[PDB]
Amino acid sequence: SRFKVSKLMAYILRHSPWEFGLEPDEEGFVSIEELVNAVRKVYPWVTEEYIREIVERDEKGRYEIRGNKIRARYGHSYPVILRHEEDKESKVLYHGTVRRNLKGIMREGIKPMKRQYVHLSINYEDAYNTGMRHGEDVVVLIIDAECLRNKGYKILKAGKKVRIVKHVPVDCISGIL
Ligand SMILES: Nc1ncnc2c1ncn2[C@@H]1O[C@H](COP(=O)(O)O)[C@@H](O)[C@H]1OP(=O)(O)O
Ligand SMILES: [Cl-]
Ligand SMILES: [Cl-]
Ligand SMILES: [K+]
Ligand SMILES: [K+]
Ligand SMILES: [K+]
Ligand SMILES: [K+]
Ligand SMILES: [K+]
Ligand SMILES: [K+]
Secondary structure (H helix, E strand, O other), X not given: OHHHHHHHHHHHHHOOOHHHOOOOOOOOOEEHHHHHHHHOOOOOOOOHHHHHXXXXXXXXXXXXXXXXXXXXXXXXXXXXXXXXXEOOOOOEEEEEEEHHXXXXXXXXXXXXXXXXXXXXXXXXXXXXXXXHHHOOOEEEEEEEHHHHHHOOOOOEEOOOOEEEEOOEOHHHEEEEO
């Protein structure tokens, strides 16, 4: 199914490409032809046309293809430089987290998990669902994106709803939901 093959694609492209004999470049891209060969180790019926279709139909914009290169647009656990197009229009973004993190966030802002980027969403519901990954007692921070930009932080369009930024200072957090 597209779900099973996309879940593997995301694991290879975000977390363990070397296990599959792939070497990402500095921007996270691998050969899409080599990716097909890697995925066929698990799902031998997959084709390049199928992987391209998964990319086109993905509801979050998880993937990006340029020529023969494919990458995950976000969520890597290894170093990548992601020169995505800047989100210049959003005025408010959201960050889902768990209540036990409020004390540190209100002291030093939102920090990336050594991940280079903090993840935000244009939608409250998506941020809530992301926060659920770290526990049950989820809260959603309202982020003043214009304030963020004014401080010099570039906010990048990483997915259809996901936005990435280096750091969110405390004074850019306008509310808790
Ligand atoms: N259809 C999918 N294709 C690729 N990755 C997926 C898919 N659904 C969930 N994932 C990923 O599995 C992890 C667990 O997700 P969840 O908590 O929603 O179950 C997330 O990294 C999530 O990435 P993503 O944030 O892009 O959905
Ligand atoms: Cl909590
Ligand atoms: Cl999110
Ligand atoms: K490659
Ligand atoms: K094909
Ligand atoms: K998908
Ligand atoms: K990648
Ligand atoms: K979030
Ligand atoms: K920006």
